Design a protein around this ligand. Structure first.
Ligand code: OLC
Ligand code: OLC
Ligand code: NAG
Length: 443
């Protein structure tokens, strides 16, 4: 082709984009150089109107496939170069999933000694707090790893979040609905409702940190989730060992607290309510029996012969069921440490280093041009991906004979950079495009 005769060397490039996305108007000017022999592009685009209202990666597809390297056996399929020097018209409809669409029209021609790309872009129906207008896309053009822990953590913590909400709710119910008094006048906080509220609240904040940290891939929330679980786990084992090295030292302590509380029963309405509800519920009477009430047991005591003591019955219950609560203890512990391992693992597989995209080319007999369609996974700040659905049509501007090709594709690789000197909003881009899809000879 005579168009490839125009592309044997490195050709200066000029790119101009005037755009409008939901009324946000902007202009981009890019300059650079195009080496079609190696399929390399080096360009530096600058936003002439201030700051770009969209993420720079969304513009790189709209921002010259005539510099694609078609290997020698595929050269007779290079429509783009054949359309030169009189150029070709490239139209596109880029549909961002669950968001707006770019609508594009562009003319690519040789103007003087330079290959020029003039584009007007109009975007409609975008979310103002979406990934596009909210600048939530990473500044790159590769695919990112799927973090399945993102979903595992979010799933369990959502369930634990709801469990905690119900535990907190039942505690809120008991604080308002029922009155079981205060067993220890000095520890007013120690009520059955408050312990529900305390444990429920702690569960919700841990589950909240796990949910928000995992689904948004926020390292700081993951570390907070880890540190908080670590602290809860450390207190648990501390209490467990501290409990058994000093069981008898704190056995006395609560026994003093109960004996102190029982002196107040005929003078403190709250401690009376505590003893009355406890005894009538557990069907017990004193600390170790009915003799603790030296003037006679209150009415809310089983009148049976040797009713067991409330404190004795409780300690016997925990000693008799130590094996069960031990199983439940290590169960909550392993769930706890599993979440720690998950979070710590997920944290390490964030912010990593860094891919190819294929533009499938198909001929259009009737408009004497080509069509193309392809999907681009833009990487979102929360780890998810934003689909950009691309449909394309290219028609030659001139009446000269152009080449209509067999189906083939272009393996594009783009590298986004930043000029450390540019104080203006900008994008330094390196691309490598090579044609493929048609194999020659016998292999
Ligand atoms: C809502 C969908 C998720 C619901 C799931 C409910 C069942 C989860 C139970 C066990 C999963 C085992 C957890 C696997 C932990 C390792 C995952 C991992 O590290 O992989 C991440 C990355 O993809 C590199 O491998
Ligand atoms: C506040 C107490 C809960 C903190 C959050 C724990 C971390 C959740 C992650 C994995 C759970 C492991 C799966 C356990 C399966 C049993 C259901
Ligand atoms: C508790 O409430 C009663 C209501 O009968 C009230 O008369 C009294 O001031 C309080 N009783 C004691 C023992 O403090």
């Amino acid at each position: 082709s005579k168009g490839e005769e125009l592309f044997t060397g490195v050709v200066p490039i000029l790119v101009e984009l005037d755009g409008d996305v939901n009324g946000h108007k902007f202009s981009v000017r890019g300059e650079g150089e195009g080496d079609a022999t190696n399929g390399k592009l080096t360009l530096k685009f600058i936003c002439t109107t201030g700051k770009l209202p969209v993420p720079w990666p969304t513009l790189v597809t709209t921002l010259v496939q005539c510099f694609s390297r078609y290997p020698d056996h595929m050269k007779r399929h290079d429509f783009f170069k054949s359309a030169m020097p009189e150029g070709y018209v490239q139209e596109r409809t880029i549909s961002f999933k669950d968001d707006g669409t770019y609508k594009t029209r562009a003319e690519v021609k040789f103007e003087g000694d330079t290959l020029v790309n003039r584009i007007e872009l109009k975007g409609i129906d975008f979310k103002e707090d979406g990934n596009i207008l909210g600048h939530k896309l990473e500044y790159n053009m590769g695919m990112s790893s799927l973090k399945l822990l993102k979903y595992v953590l979010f799933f369990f913590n959502l369930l634990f979040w709801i469990c905690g909400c119900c535990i907190l709710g039942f505690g809120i119910y008991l604080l308002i609905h029922n009155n079981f008094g205060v067993l220890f006048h000095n520890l007013p906080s120690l009520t059955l409702g408050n312990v529900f509220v305390i444990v429920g609240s702690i569960i919700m904040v841990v589950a909240f940190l796990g949910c928000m940290g995992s689904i948004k891939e926020n390292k700081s929330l993951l570390m907070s989730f880890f540190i908080l679980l670590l602290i809860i786990l450390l207190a648990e084992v501390t209490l467990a060992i501290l409990l058994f090295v000093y069981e008898q030292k704190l056995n006395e302590y609560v026994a003093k607290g109960l004996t102190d509380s029982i002196h107040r029963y005929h003078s403190d309405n709250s401690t009376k309510a505590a003893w009355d509800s406890i005894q009538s519920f557990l069907q017990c009477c004193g600390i170790a029996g009915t003799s603790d009430w030296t003037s006679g047991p209150p009415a809310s005591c089983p009148s049976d012969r040797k009713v067991e003591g409330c404190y004795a019955k409780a300690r016997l219950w925990f000693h008799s069921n130590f094996l069960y609560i031990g199983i439940i203890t290590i169960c909550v512990c392993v769930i706890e440490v599993l979440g720690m391992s998950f979070a710590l693992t997920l944290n390490s597989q964030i912010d990593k280093t860094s891919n190819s995209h294929n533009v499938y080319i198909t001929a259009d007999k009737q408009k004497n041009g080509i069509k193309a369609n392809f999907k681009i996974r833009h990487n979102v700040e929360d780890g998810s991906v934003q689909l950009a659905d691309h449909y394309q049509q290219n028609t030659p501007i001139g009446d000269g004979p152009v080449l209509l090709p067999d189906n083939h594709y272009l393996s594009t690789q783009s590298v986004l950079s930043k000029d450390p000197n540019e104080k203006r909003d900008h994008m330094v881009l390196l691309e490598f495009v090579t044609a493929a899809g048609i194999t020659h000879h016998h292999h």
